[PDB]
């Protein structure tokens, strides 16, 4: 209820409430690293001569 610094009368009626959760994790196979399908950063993957 109050703008005042630190503590003031009405901040006794103040309440706390938990943060929203965010699971920093990876996908069902975690694919997002290798450029498998991307036309730019694709792999040649050829021979020592050919």
């Amino acid at each position: 209820p109050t703008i005042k610094e630190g503590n003031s009368r009405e901040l006794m009626g103040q309440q706390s409430m938990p943060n929203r959760p965010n699971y920093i994790a990876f996908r069902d196979n975690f694919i997002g690293l290798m450029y498998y399908n991307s036309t730019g950063n694709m792999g040649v993957l050829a021979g020592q001569a050919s």
Partner: protein, 50 residues
Amino acid sequence: HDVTTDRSQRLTLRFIPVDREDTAYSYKARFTLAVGDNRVLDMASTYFDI
């Protein structure tokens, strides 16, 4: 029919050197390239993409 190729052959070979060496002034690379068992290669068309 007594002239240029009809069977499949790529005009260019996008080759990468195996070992690398960098030092004060030199930029050495020992590339291991073997010319295809039938096909020929021109030296005036040979260059380096750096």
